[PDB]
Amino acid sequence: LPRRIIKETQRLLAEPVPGIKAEPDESNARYFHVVIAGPQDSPFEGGTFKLELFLPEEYPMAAPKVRFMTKIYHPNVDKLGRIKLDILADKWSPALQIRTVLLSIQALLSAPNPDDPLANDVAEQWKTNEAQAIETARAWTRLYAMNNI
Amino acid sequence: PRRIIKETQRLLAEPVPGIKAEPDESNARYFHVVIAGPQDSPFEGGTFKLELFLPEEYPMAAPKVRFMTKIYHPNVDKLGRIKLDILADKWSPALQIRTVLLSIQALLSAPNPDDPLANDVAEQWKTNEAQAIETARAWTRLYAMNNI
Amino acid sequence: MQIFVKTLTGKTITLEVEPSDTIENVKAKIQDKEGIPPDQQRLIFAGKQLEDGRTLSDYNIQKESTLHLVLRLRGG
Amino acid sequence: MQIFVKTLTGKTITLEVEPSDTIENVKAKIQDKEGIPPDQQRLIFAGKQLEDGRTLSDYNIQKESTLHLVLRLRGG
Amino acid sequence: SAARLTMMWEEVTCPICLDPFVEPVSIECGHSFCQECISQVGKGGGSVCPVCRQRFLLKNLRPNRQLANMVNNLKEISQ
Amino acid sequence: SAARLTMMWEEVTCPICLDPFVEPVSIECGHSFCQECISQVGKGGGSVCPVCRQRFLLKNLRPNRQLANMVNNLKEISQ
Ligand SMILES: [Zn+2]
Ligand SMILES: [Zn+2]
Ligand SMILES: [Zn+2]
Ligand SMILES: [Zn+2]
C-alpha cells in the first residue's frame, strides 16, 4: 500500500474534479472504477464513458493500466477499449497522478489524432469523411455512452 | 544602504556578549567598537577599542578595521592594523559586522605567530611564548583597562 | 482578474489575467511560478485542451475559473 | 540538552547535544542543517575559538548556551 | 489559517511520493525531489524531469537544504 | 507563534543582501542567493560561495522557485 496511492485516493474523494469520477474497489485499492464526461465542443459531449484503471506495483514509476469499458468511436481507441496515448507509455511521468491521467484521456477525446492510428478504420474515416465520423461518434455517444450508469 | 540598516538594527536590538558596535552620529559607515578580551587568554579582562568603517562596496568588500587600543599580538602592528584573511582575500559578503568582530575576538584567543605581520612580536611569541604572554597580559592592564 | 490553475501535484496557484489574454500568456505566468516550459504545458478546461492562439474569453473562462495543468500528451 | 548556534545570517538553530559531545560532533549537526563542511566552520563561545578535540563540558557550555558560527579565519 | 499552511505544505511536497521532502535535492532544471524518489526515476545515471521532462544526470544532483529546514519548521508549527 | 513565523522568514532570507529572496538561484554547493546578489559576487565568471567558500561558476546557476513561492506565501500571511 504505497502511501502515494492512499493520498491520491484520498484527494480524489475529497477534492473532486468536474467531469471525472474515480472510486476504488473495496476488494482492490489498486483497481479504480472510473467515469469520464465527454468533453464539450466534441462529438462525445453529453457522454458518460466508463473506464477501468489499475495501478501496477511499480506505480508511480510506471503508468497506470487504463482501458475504456464503454464503446467509443475514436481513432486512438480500439474495439477492446485499449488506449494508445504516449503519457500511458513512453512519455509517462511519475509526477502524473490518476487525476491528470484521466484529464489527459479526456483531452484526447477533445483532440483526436488520426495520422498515428490505433483503430485504422476509424482514422481513415476521420480523414476521408470527417463530418460522417463526427456524426457517428455523436451517435455512439447517445447509443452507448448515455443511460449507461 | 539597507544591509547596513538591518545589520546596525540587530546590533542595537539583539546584542552579542562581549562586543559593542554603535554607529557614529556623523557617519553611519563608521562604527565605534569595543571588544572584550577572550577568557583563558593573555587579553582576559581587557576592553579593546576598535574602529570599523564600511566602504561603499560593502558587503562585496570587507570592512576596514583597526585597533585603537594598544595590543601586543603577532597579527596586529603598532598602528593597530590587523592582518586577518577574512578582512582581505578570504572575505565573504555573508560575513557581517557581528561575525567580523567575533572573528577578531577569536584571533586574540588563537594568535598565529608562525607567519609574521609584526616580526618583532611574532618571533618573540615562538622563541619565548611565556614572556610574550606576560607582556600581552601586562599591556592589557596598562592600556586595555580604565580606557572606557 | 484572478483565475486558478491546479498544478500536477494538485497545488492550486492564483494568476492575475485579463479576458483578452491568450493561453500562451497564461502558460508564461505558470512558467514563471512553476518552471514548466509552455511547450510542455497543456491546460484543460471543461475537458478541452485549450489552444495557444485563442483567448480566455474565447473559452468563456471567467473570474475564479480553475484550469487544470497536464503535460504534453499525444494520441497515437 | 539543547544548545543554540547563531549562523552567519544571524538565524539561530537548535541542536540536541550531550555535555560529552566533541566540537566536531556539533559541526556535523551544523553541517547536516546548514551545509557547511566542518573544515570551514569555526564556533565562538566567550570569545574563544572552540577546538575540535575538546568537549562542551571542557568549556562549561550548559543548557541554552549560544555558540556563534564564523568562517575559517587565519591571522597569519 | 490552515488554508495558507496548506499552500506552504504543498510547496514542500515531493511531486513523486507526495510526502513532505526527505533529503530535498534539485536537478539541472531547478525542480526539487526527494533524493530517493529522483534517484529511482534516474536509475542508470539519468532520465527526464517528472515535472518539465528536461534531461537530468544523477551526478548533477544538488542539495536544497532550505526546503528541508522549512519542512521541519512547518512540522513543528503543527505541534 | 511569531518565533516560528520569523524562523521561516529567515530561511527565505538572502545571506548577502539580507532581504527575502528575489529570483532565488542555487550554486553547485546547494546554497541559494538572489540572482543579482550572487552574480555580482561571481562577476567575471564565478567565485566562492559566501557560506562555505566552495567554488561556483555563474553558468551553473540553478533556479530555486520553491524558495520564491515560500516568500510570496509568507507575504500573504503578514499584512
Ligand atoms: Zn519523494
Ligand atoms: Zn524540471
Ligand atoms: Zn540577495
Ligand atoms: Zn555553499
Numbering used by the authors:
A (entry chain C): 4 to 152
B (entry chain E): 5 to 152
C (entry chain D), D (entry chain F): 1 to 76
E (entry chain A), F (entry chain B): 3 to 81
Task: Please quote the authors directly.
TRIM21 is further distinct in that it does not engage its target directly but indirectly using antibodies, which behaves as a natural PROTAC (proteolysis targeting chimera). These properties of indirect targeting and ubiquitination allow TRIM21 to inhibit infection by a diverse array of pathogens, including viruses, bacteria, and prions, by causing their proteasomal degradation and activating immune signaling. Antibody-dependent virus neutralization by TRIM21 is dependent on interaction with its canonical E2 enzymes Ube2W and Ube2N(Ubc13)/Ube2V2(Uev2). Here, we have described a general E2-specific mechanism of RING E3 catalysis, in which a tri-ionic motif provides conformation-specific anchor points that capture the Ube2N~Ub closed conformation.
The structure was solved to 2.8 Å resolution with two full complexes (2xT21-R and 2xUbe2N~Ub) in the asymmetric unit. The overall domain orientation shows Ube2N~Ub in the closed conformation primed for catalysis bound by the two protomers in the RING dimer. While Ube2N only contacts the proximal RING domain, ubiquitin is bound by both the proximal and distal RING. The generic interactions present in our structure include the Ube2N S96 sidechain, which forms a hydrogen bond to TRIM21 P52 carbonyl, and Ube2N R7 sidechain, which forms a hydrogen bond to TRIM21 I18 carbonyl. The TRIM21 linchpin-residue (R55) contacts Ube2N (K94 carbonyl) and ubiquitin (Q40 sidechain and R72 carbonyl) simultaneously. Residues E12 and D21 hold Ube2N in place via a cluster of positively charged residues (R6, R7, K10, and R14) arranged on the same RING-facing surface of Ube2N helix 1, supported by interactions with backbone carbonyls (I18 and L20). The tri-ionic motif is perfectly positioned to capture the E2~Ub specifically in its active, closed conformation, providing ideally distributed anchor points.
